[PDB]
């Protein structure tokens, strides 16, 4: 597994691969690991598949529940806190092999400068969190290869689209150097999933655009 | 037995309340009075409009007017009726009533 | 007396319901429209309950807000326990009826409240908007076109009876609802919709300048 | 009959508020100003609730200090559970309303108290001061300019009605508030501000020689 | 007097059932037929209880639905604890009798409800349909041919007395039941059967166009 | 409570 | 044990073998592992026999209970969820060696296209689930051989009958390469059990049909 | 009528305090002086509460000793939970202000007690002695010079009003206090001081021959 | 009315103590002497409480034996929790006073009992015997010479007033106590001492032939 | 009124003890003899309590059998907790007295029962039989020779007073007891002994032909 997130001028983008394994055996070719938890956040979760999907679902429920009771969404700080508490609550089960780490991307509507209202937040198994300041983050078995790829590719990120291409490429290298991360499957037509958040909310990138970018990358490397 | 015919309400020793209608206090004299009032209304209609005859609506007006006249008086029957009611219900009669008729609100 | 309680509690709560502002809910082309006469900016009488289920109320604020919160609680516990598309406006209405009956018979004072639960179809789906009215005793009524709650309901209900038109647009339904409600500017109106066209969360408030344009 | 017994409770709570001192809270350029007539040096009627939310009260001291403590408890539990900037004066006001309604209907004696919750904007932010008044029954009212609590409120409220000026400095608002309150030296006044310019904790008492200079 | 108070409760409960709409249940060739006069589309007075056990009721909705739910609970807990073929209509009827007696003597207000529990034989088995009527006090009566509940039961019971025919088909029993009930279209009828021919779950609603064809 | 079915 | 399930144009089919062992010893020659939990679902359970039969029973009870209380069956999503919660509940006993894994086949009446309303859902020991898209699934000790057989045989599936034959054959190969899975016993006349679900509900395939299919396969291979 | 019941409670408490001996507490150069008229040798009406906080009472023995014990409990739990120098006479007075209010409104009979909490400064520190009087009403009066409790308080309070002198030595304040109390030998007096000069524990009884020399 | 019924118990209790036997306790050279008029051989009215603390009572037995047991419980729990020499007659007397007060103002019926707690010095130590009398009110009195409980106390108290002599031997104090009690053989007397000369357990009964010789 | 409740409780219990058969217990050479007038063959009024402690009762069967059971419980718990020879008739009698003092004043209806607890010496030991009688009030009487319970006690007591002889054999004491009881065959008598000569369990019934020979 591998989920990258990067801030571009005006927004944030978050992409994830599609493979799910059991040991050396490829068990799922089309899992979706990036959810839209609310109109201005997206959550990727690496780790145990069950714990992951459950985290995402329950967190979305809680954000929206407070929103309905109080008539206003939490601040980005409150959201960060609730996600952190949910993570800290799974620590006992994570030491028993049910670990799930979330990477949270959001667009702060209350921030001062719109061009840097993007937000990326990473968590450890012990519930502590950290607001990223180097423009990108990743989680999963391929995260180191993805980060080392984005460190070099990130000067090319100038808008929503270039940021999307850099995301897809980083995923391609993760998969290229790690067997637990699936790359673009040209035969079956299965590509990474992507979510874009900007001033107007969160939208899923339709598959065709990701297919294009993947084919451009694959052509470039041959 | 409709809402408009609810004449009296009685509170028993247990505190239970019964809605007595004008039927329980009806009499042949009441029938004669209703008929006489209807006849007088028919005479008035003949004198004013000029159409001879007695209508059913005259009887309806007579009966509603008679009930309205007799409903203002709570004590219009002998105590034997109250004793019979108490013996039937089994409870002592303590009250009689006529059926003539703070914050954070959003 | 058993008779005294039912007749006296009934009067105490019908009074407190007529002793309040008026709310209307009506079906229009894009879903359901809630229009309430509400001066405050913090206290609200219209609320999202679940993805496609909305809620309006009239009476004593602390109590129908207690019901608002209980309903939210219920809907989310069901949606998580089973699934989102399993929670329906019908279940919610039924729960409010049971709860208002239990309150009306068991508590000291009856809830001087009148509820309206509204539901629209899911996205890309086709189905008629459903309106339910729950009264203080637990009674529940199925409304085909519009619900009027609180204050004097007769003149508003009649004005709506003459002006109502199925498949009226959002602006026409707003004009009809404000007109029949008068029988008020953006500073005294609480307006929201259950827009059937939204993908998931259908409830959407119409406030400020957008509301200004619509009316 | 329940409504008539409630009328007896309304009067008893009102009598206790009437038999007490007077507090005023008004908006000025730097935020909100609380000026209370208070002889004691240990017992206080003005308090910080949260970073930008202040609180004033008038009535039996044991009961509005019970509310003071409950509100502090609430605000801190929320701020820690979610975050500091999520606790708002509006939530606090609403909780006080629910609690005073429940007390007014369920307890033996109603709380002879009158509350005012005040809120200003955050540091470097721009927004108008909000004043809410919560009465003994649970009623809550949104005030744009000033709140007067306890004692005879008419003459003070009218004097403020003539003297009030938006964006008055701290000294002018203090003169206006003391003048309208008279309708008293530093040994009989409790004065504090919700200074909108402070970075985090906005509440700040003005006592002793600094108060002496201001008035 | 306890006897007079009991007469006050007996009388109370009889009047509420009279307010409710009427229901009939009768045996026919394929099992048992429930035909109720029901205008609402969401609120139902006929229900599956277990594989071969059905249930009809007449009276205050928020109470006979409470009994409906309790009965479902009971039947499933037994069926799982022992086995499905061990739960019988007789046990269910007995539980409702105990429960309505306990309610009638211990609770403040007696349920204004009248129940009918129906049972048919299992698939490929032969046995006569059993109908039980449970009244508000706890009394239970074994009916050979038909049960009539709620409203004025005399004219319907007599019309059925003249029209009833054992081993009448589904259409004839529907005509007889609707006729005796009149003493109404698909928009005002709730019709269901305990079809003895189904393999496991015998209860089956007859609504819409199929109901239209049958009547 | 007028809720009788 | 081995239970296969495959979608065909217009429906779903689910078949299971009949053997039950204790170590190397053949203890049951006629166990039924595929249940009809309701009019539109069928549930196979591999693993510990007790926990298996108990799961099936309790789940059927719960589906039908909610149906009686609310007057309408859950959506296929709700059913998936409740099954997942049961499975997650048995996790401790599964690590104590009482593991039971369910495979859920269903026909969604609310789906848009009737020809693809078939549904196959697989679960792990930790309650996570996954909706299958490659058109077939299997569970049990012979599942890998069954899946590798259906991958090749699946282009032949064009209706209810061809899909049934492919199911029976996949079972035959599972049994052919694994000793814990029983094949068709021609001597005692015991054949796999099968359930077919389509627009009209769930029916059990009568034994004769499975007998003929098994005999056709056996003659084809000799 | 709670309006009348409260009146008989207040009168009953007042009679009980009047039907008791008299205690005085006054400020002098070395701190605070308690002088009570007490015949028993085992039963005491003056007590250490915390390092620098003393306590005197007048009324019913078992009740003000109940309060004595509660206050000791409170003070020690605070001092251990935070620190010794955080417990102040003001907190203690406030706790007895709220406990006596709760008792006065909630318990069958109001406590017939009158309390005085005294505090002096820490060692090598400078600050004026603080005296608080807590009544059965729960009212807390801040006293600058002396408190008189129990019995007929007027003549003693006036005699002290003429004789009081700030910064009187221990012997002069003892003469003034005994004189005004008379308006009694070592066998009928309970005398203790809050000596501000002690390093930690300020309370110190003056009994026997030392008391004999002082008076 | 607190005056009629809190006082109502006072007559009730006084009457119960008068229809009982008389007990006396007096100081003599070797400690304290209890002499009670007691016909039974099983039921007693004099008891050891702790090493040097004795106890006598008069009035309803189920009540003063309940107190006897409670006091034993208390004393042993203290002695074990701290040490034996820490439990004093004074603490015990105080606990009995609190407990008899709490029964007086809460239980249905007041304990028709009268208690006397006695204490002597430890072995080889010097100190005067202490006698305390606790009444049904909760009142406690310090006696220097003797206590008389139950029945008509005036003639016995006066006879003791004339005959009492400090440092009387055991035989003289027994003669004085029996004489004043008469105002009875070994078969109608319960006699015990708190012998100050014993090393640890001071209580010691004097029965049978030894009692015969002493009197 | 405490006095009226005491005189009402007392005259009802007494109207139950005299509304029952008669039992006698008397001392004889070999121990104690219980002779009761009892027609039933299953219901018994004489019982073993512990090794050497017997029990007879007269009144309401369910209640004195409740006491029978409680006493058995008590005695066995003590005997196991300490030892068998530590449980004495005196403790048992005392517990029954406390229980009949608590039931009489606290329960709705006093127990209409009259108890007699009997004890003899251990095997090879010498000591006089002890009889105690516990009344429904909670008083206990020490009897030297015989106890008579229930029905008309005075005529039976008068006869025993003339016929009683200490150290009478078993046959003589049986004749005396049956004679005085008459003031009845083996089919209407319940006879048991506390035979002091038995090694451990002293209680022993005398029924049937052996009883026939003895009388």
Structure tokens at I127: 């100190």
Beta bridge partners of E192: E34, E205
Q: Where are the alpha helices (DSSP H) in chain G?
A: 49-70, 76-89, 91-95, 143-153, 160-177, 207-221
Q: What is the dihedral of CA D46, D50, D51, D57, to 10 degrees?
A: -20
* C-alpha span between B77 and H126 (Å, rounded): 90
Contact criterion met (CB below 8 Å) for H202 and H192: no
E72 and chain G in contact, CB less than 8 A: yes
The helix or strand, by DSSP H or E, that contains position E122, with its residue range, turns out to be none
The residues, ordered by sequence, that sit 6+ positions from H25 with a Cβ below 8 Å of its Cβ are H32, H33, H34, H35, H56, H116, H118, H131, H146, H147, H149
- The residue among A6, A106, A96, A82 whose CA lies nearest residue A47 is A96
Contact criterion met (CB below 8 Å) for D44 and D190: yes
Q: SS3 of C116, please?
A: strand
- The residue among I162, I171, I66 whose CA lies nearest residue I115 is I66
Around Cβ C4, how many Cβ atoms within 10 Å?
13
Integer angstrom CA distances of residue G133 from A30, B64, I24, J202? 9, 79, 101, 88
The label of the residue with tokens 């007889």 reads: E176
- The residue among I13, I45, I12 whose CA lies nearest residue I113 is I13
The helix or strand, by DSSP H or E, that contains position C47, with its residue range, turns out to be strand C46-50
Q: What phi and psi, each to the nearest 5 degrees, are found at residue J89? A: -60, -30
* C-alpha span between D169 and I24 (Å, rounded): 84
Q: SS3 of E121, please?
A: coil
| Residues comprising chain C, all counted | 215
- The residue among E150, A206, G33, H88 whose CA lies nearest residue F4 is E150
Task: Give yes or no: A2 in active site.
Answer: no
The label of the residue with tokens 């359970």 reads: G45
Strand pairing of G41-47 and G34-38? antiparallel
Residue B27, CA atoms < 13 Å, CB-side half-sphere: 8
Q: Do chains C and J touch (3 or more CB pairs under 8 A)?
A: no
Around Cβ C165, how many Cβ atoms within 10 Å?
13
The answer to whether the Cα torsion of B7, B9, B10, B14 is positive or negative is positive
- The residue among H106, H97, H95 whose CA lies nearest residue H135 is H97
Q: Distance between the two ends of chain I, CA-based, in angstroms?
A: 52
Around Cβ J167, how many Cβ atoms within 10 Å?
10
For residue G131, what are the domain limits?
1-217
Beta bridge partners of D141: D133
Minimum distance, in Å, between the CA of residue E215 and any CA atom of chain B: 37
Ordered strands of the C113-119 beta sheet? C46-50, C53-59, C113-119, C130-134, C140-143
Structural domain contains residue G16 = yes
* C-alpha span between J118 and J133 (Å, rounded): 9
* C-alpha span between I9 and I16 (Å, rounded): 10
- The residue among A218, A188, A209 whose CA lies nearest residue A29 is A188
Q: Residue E126: left if φ>0, alpha if ψ -120 to 50, beta else—which one?
A: beta
Q: Give me the catalytic one of G1, G41, G43, G48.
A: G1
* C-alpha span between I199 and I122 (Å, rounded): 8
The residues, ordered by sequence, that sit 6+ positions from A166 with a Cβ below 8 Å of its Cβ are A6, A150, A153, A154, A156, A157
* C-alpha span between H101 and H107 (Å, rounded): 10
Domains of chain G: total: 1
> Per-residue b/e over A151-186, b at no fewer than 16 CB within 10 Å?
eebbeebeebeebbbbbbbbbbbbbeebebbbbbee
Integer angstrom CA distances of residue A83 from A119, A122, G126? 14, 10, 22
**Chain A residues whose beta carbon lies within 8 Å of the beta carbon of residue G124:** 49-50
Strand pairing of H146-149 and H23-28? antiparallel
* C-alpha span between I162 and H195 (Å, rounded): 48
CA angle A213, A216, A220 (to 5 degrees): 140
Question: Chain C residue with minimal CA distance to A59?
Answer: C80
Q: What is the dihedral of CA B36, B40, B42, B46, to 10 degrees?
A: 150
| Residues comprising chain I, all counted | 215
Q: Distance between the two ends of chain F, CA-based, in angstroms?
A: 12
The helix or strand, by DSSP H or E, that contains position B27, with its residue range, turns out to be none
* C-alpha span between J22 and J57 (Å, rounded): 9
Beta bridge partners of A101: A46
Question: Chain H residue with minimal CA distance to D64?
Answer: H98
Contact criterion met (CB below 8 Å) for I57 and I118: no
DSSP I128-152: --EEEEE-TTS-EEEESSEEEESS-
Q: SS3 of I118, please?
A: strand
- The residue among E118, E114, E63 whose CA lies nearest residue E92 is E118
H56 and chain D in contact, CB less than 8 A: no
Contact criterion met (CB below 8 Å) for J26 and J160: yes
Structural domain contains residue A222 = no
Q: Do C16 and B105 touch (CB under 8 A)?
A: yes
Q: Do chains B and G touch (3 or more CB pairs under 8 A)?
A: no
- Listed as own residue / partner, the contacts of B39-43 with beta carbons closer than 8 Å and 24 or more positions apart are none
How determined? cryo-EM
For residue H87, the 8-state DSSP code is -
**Chain C residues whose beta carbon lies within 8 Å of the beta carbon of residue G82:** 82
3-state DSSP of A112-167: CCHHHCEEEEEECCCCCEEECCCCEEEECCCHHHHHHHHHHHHHHCCCHHHHHHHH
3-state helix, strand, coil in chain F (%, to 5): 0, 20, 80
Resolution in A: 3.8
* C-alpha span between E14 and E7 (Å, rounded): 10
Integer angstrom CA distances of residue B5 from B9, B29, B36? 12, 19, 21
Domain ranges of chain H: 1-215
* C-alpha span between G3 and G12 (Å, rounded): 13
The answer to whether the Cα torsion of A175, A176, A177, A178 is positive or negative is positive
The CATH code of the domain that includes G129 is 3.60.20.10
* C-alpha span between I50 and I85 (Å, rounded): 10
3-state DSSP of chain D: CHHHHHHHHHHHHHHHHHCCCCEEEEEECCEEEEEEECCCCCCCCEEEEECCEEEEEEECHHHHHHHHHHHHHHHHHHHHHCCHHHCCHHHHHHHHHHHHHHHHHHCCCCCCEEEEEEECCCCCCCCCCEEEEECCCCCEEEECCEEEECCCHHHHHHHHHHHCCCCCCHHHHHHHHHHHHHCCCCCCEEEEEEECCCCCCCEEECCHHHHHHHC
* C-alpha span between E16 and C10 (Å, rounded): 17
Contact criterion met (CB below 8 Å) for A140 and A45: no
- The residue among E48, E62, E68 whose CA lies nearest residue E16 is E62
Strand pairing of E130-134 and E113-119? antiparallel
Strand pairing of H140-143 and H23-28? unpaired
- The residue among E45, E13, E15 whose CA lies nearest residue E136 is E13
* C-alpha span between H53 and H46 (Å, rounded): 11
Q: Do C42 and D2 touch (CB under 8 A)?
A: no
Count of helix runs (H) and strand runs (E) in chain I: 6, 10
Beta bridge partners of J142: J132
Contact criterion met (CB below 8 Å) for H92 and H117: yes
Q: SS3 of A63, please?
A: helix
Integer angstrom CA distances of residue H83 from A136, C169, H48, H75, H77? 48, 70, 18, 10, 10
The residues, ordered by sequence, that sit 6+ positions from I193 with a Cβ below 8 Å of its Cβ are I30, I31, I32, I33, I34, I170, I203, I204, I206
Instruction: Give which of G128, G134, G147 to mutate to test A binding, by max A Cβ within 10 Å.
Output: G128
The label of the residue with tokens 């009670």 reads: I36
Q: Do G130 and A28 touch (CB under 8 A)?
A: yes
* C-alpha span between E31 and E45 (Å, rounded): 19
Residue H190, CA atoms < 13 Å, CB-side half-sphere: 21
- The residue among D161, D150, D157, D148 whose CA lies nearest residue D183 is D157
The residues, ordered by sequence, that sit 6+ positions from H123 with a Cβ below 8 Å of its Cβ are H196, H197, H198, H199, H200
Q: For C69, which of A57, A64, A69 is closest by C-beta distance? A: A69
Q: Could you say which of 3.40.1260.10, 3.60.20.10, 3.40.50.2300, 1.10.3720.10 is the CATH number of the domain covering D1-215?
A: 3.60.20.10
Contact criterion met (CB below 8 Å) for H66 and H112: no
* C-alpha span between E78 and E85 (Å, rounded): 10
- The residue among I60, E47, B88 whose CA lies nearest residue J2 is I60
- Listed as own residue / partner, the contacts of C91-94 with beta carbons closer than 8 Å and 24 or more positions apart are C91/G70, C92/C49, C92/C50, C92/C53, C92/C55, C92/C117, C93/C117, C93/C132, C93/C134, C93/C140, C93/E42, C94/C140, C94/E42
The residues, ordered by sequence, that sit 6+ positions from I24 with a Cβ below 8 Å of its Cβ are I34, I35, I36, I146, I147, I148, I149, I156, I160, I177, I180, I181
How many Cβ contacts (< 8 angstroms) between chains A and C?
A: 15
Structure tokens at D97: 């309303």
Contact criterion met (CB below 8 Å) for A86 and A55: yes
Q: Where are the alpha helices (DSSP H) in chain J?
A: 2-17, 61-81, 89-106, 153-163, 170-182, 208-214
Q: Do J2 and I109 touch (CB under 8 A)?
A: yes
Contact criterion met (CB below 8 Å) for D96 and D59: no
Integer angstrom CA distances of residue H45 from D111, D168, H58, H60, H69? 34, 56, 7, 10, 12
* C-alpha span between C20 and C113 (Å, rounded): 10
Q: For C97, which of E41, E62, E109 is closest by C-beta distance? A: E62
CA angle C115, C121, C122 (to 5 degrees): 120
Strand residue runs (E) in chain E: 23-28, 31-37, 46-50, 53-59, 113-119, 130-134, 140-143, 146-149, 189-195, 203-205
Contact criterion met (CB below 8 Å) for J44 and J190: yes
| Chains near C (3 or more Cβ pairs under 8 Å) | A, B, D, E, F, G
Q: What phi and psi, each to the nearest 5 degrees, are found at residue D132? A: -125, 140
CA angle B82, B86, B90 (to 5 degrees): 175
């Amino acid at each position: 597994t591998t989920i990258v997130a990067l801030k571009y001028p005006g927004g944030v983008v978050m992409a994830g691969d599609r493979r799910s394994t059991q040991g050396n055996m490829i068990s799922g070719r089309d899992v979706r690991k990036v959810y839209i938890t609310d109109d201005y956040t997206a959550t990727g979760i690496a780790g145990t598949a069950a714990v992951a999907v459950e985290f995402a679902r329950l967190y979305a429920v809680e954000l929206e529940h407070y929103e309905k009771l109080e008539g206003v969404p939490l601040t980005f700080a409150g959201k960060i806190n609730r996600l952190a508490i949910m993570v800290r609550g799974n620590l006992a089960a994570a030491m028993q092999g049910l670990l799930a780490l979330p990477l949270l991307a959001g667009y702060d509507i209350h921030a001062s400068d719109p061009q840097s209202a993007g937000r990326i937040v990473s968590f450890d198994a012990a519930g502590g969190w950290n607001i990223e300041e180097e423009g990108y983050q990743a989680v999963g078995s391929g995260s180191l290869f993805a980060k080392s790829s984005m460190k070099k590719l990130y000067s090319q990120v100038t808008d929503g689209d270039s940021g999307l291409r850099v995301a897809v490429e980083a995923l391609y290298d993760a998969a290229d150097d790690d067997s637990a991360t699936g790359g673009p499957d040209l035969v079956r037509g299965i590509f990474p999933t992507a979510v874009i958040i900007d001033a107007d909310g969160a939208v899923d990138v339709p598959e065709s655009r990701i297919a294009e970018l993947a084919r451009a990358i694959i052509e470039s490397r041959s | 037995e409709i809402d408009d015919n609810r004449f009296l309400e009685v509170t028993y020793a247990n505190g239970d309340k019964e809605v007595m209608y004008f039927k329980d206090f009806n009499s042949g004299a009441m029938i004669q009075n209703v008929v006489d009032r209807a006849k007088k209304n028919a005479i008035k209609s003949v004198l004013e409009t000029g159409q001879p005859g007695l209508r059913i609506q005259h009887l309806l007006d007579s009966i509603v007017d008679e009930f309205a006249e007799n409903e203002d008086l709570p004590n219009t029957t002998n105590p034997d009726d109250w004793a019979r009611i108490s013996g039937k219900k089994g409870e002592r009669i303590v009250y009689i009533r006529t059926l003539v008729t703070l914050g954070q609100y959003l | 007396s058993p008779e005294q309680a039912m007749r006296e509690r009934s009067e105490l709560a019908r009074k407190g319901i007529a002793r309040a502002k008026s709310v209307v809910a009506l079906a229009y082309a894009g879903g359901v429209l809630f229009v309430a006469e509400n001066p405050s900016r913090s206290l609200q009488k219209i609320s999202e309950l679940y993805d496609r289920v909305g809620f309006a109320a009239a009476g004593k604020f602390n109590e129908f807000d207690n019901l608002r919160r209980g309903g939210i609680q219920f809907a989310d516990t069901r949606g998580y326990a089973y699934d989102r598309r399993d929670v329906t406006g019908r279940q919610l209405a039924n729960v409010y009826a049971q709860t208002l009956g239990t309150i009306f018979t068991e508590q000291a004072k009856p809830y001087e409240v009148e509820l309206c639960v509204a539901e629209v179809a899911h996205y890309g789906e086709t189905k008629r908007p459903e309106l339910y009215r729950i009264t203080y005793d637990g009674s529940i009524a199925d409304e085909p076109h519009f619900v009027v709650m609180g204050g004097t309901t007769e003149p508003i209900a009649n004005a709506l009876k003459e002006s109502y038109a199925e498949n009226a647009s959002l602006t026409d339904a707003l004009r009809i609802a404000v007109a029949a409600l008068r029988a008020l500017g953006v500073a005294s109106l609480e307006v929201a919709v259950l827009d059937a066209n939204r993908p998931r969360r259908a409830f959407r408030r119409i406030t400020g300048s957008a509301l200004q344009a619509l009316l």
